[PDB]
Amino acid sequence: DPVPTVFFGDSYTANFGIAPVTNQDSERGWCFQAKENYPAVATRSLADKGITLDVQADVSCGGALIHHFWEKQELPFGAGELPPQQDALKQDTQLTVGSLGGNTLGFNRILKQCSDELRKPSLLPGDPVDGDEPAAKCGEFFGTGDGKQWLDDQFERVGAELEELLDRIGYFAPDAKRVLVGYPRLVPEDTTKCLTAAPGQTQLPFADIPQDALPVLDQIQKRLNDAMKKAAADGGADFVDLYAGTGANTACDGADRGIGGLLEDSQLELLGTKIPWYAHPNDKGRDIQAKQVADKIEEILN
């Protein structure tokens, strides 16, 4: 029996950096939705464990905020407007899986805040929160400065919106089992490991980001992790806690890293160029995601 399924989400579901991309040539070209994202790979793994997903839509797309689940997404350069991801759900939809939230928190603006390299033109959406404060001072800015309060505001919007996201699912796919996928760990518990460049890399995992800024960045992912877990417990969703088991597959775990580096090259080629990972899962990190996700679904369908 087919399990009608809809895959939704942001750059961690679409798997920015893995190529080839689906819709290469059409407007959804700018979602940077790998053909082989954790959704594709989980589907296959599940199939040979005999679980048959009949995938109805995979509308993950990069840069997607939580409210793009219910508002139009505007793709860069005039690519166009994509319709609300809620539009993919059907009443007969029985399983919904995706990660949404990092962008509403605005983890991209926290990266650019801590890095002037990142403050120049890049395909990473967003602006520094305070573009006048200097990259270097960023571990203060969010720990003691104005950033500290900007964080609690964002975190308040994030909880209200995940609750709302959980409720439209419940409204439109009333029979649907909801799986919220958490983000894997970016920085390890021992930041000193970030101080070395990964085997075969010339740049550091997090480029020009002050080493003192790394533990704040984890503090802030921990939080977002907890916000997401709560959101799901309280909304009747299941959560795939990727952070808790990626403690040795971070950005900084050398060749066991599951997060491609900030400036490291993805597989994405735009004119004769690799576009960097930008802190997104890599092949290893995408296999963990697929595995952990395939694991929960199986659990949940039994």
What this model shows, in words?
There is one protein chain. This protein has 302 residues and is α/β, with parallel strands linked by helices. The protein has one domain: SGNH hydrolase (Rossmann fold). Helices cover 31% and strands 12% of the residues. It is built from 8 helices and 9 strands. The chain has helices at 11-14, 38-47, 102-105, 107-113, 138-141, 146-172, 214-233, 283-300; strands at 3-7, 53-58, 73-75, 80-82, 95-98, 177-181, 238-240, 265-269, 274-276. The strands form 3 sheets. The chain has a 5-stranded parallel beta sheet with strand order 2-1-5-6-7, sandwiched between helices. A two-stranded antiparallel sheet has the order 3-4. A hairpin with a 4-residue loop joins strand 3 (73-75) and strand 4. Helix 2 (38-47) packs across helix 8 (283-300). The longest helix has 27 residues, at 146-172. This is Esterase. GO terms for molecular function: carboxylic ester hydrolase activity. Keywords: Disulfide bond, Hydrolase, Secreted, Serine esterase, Signal.
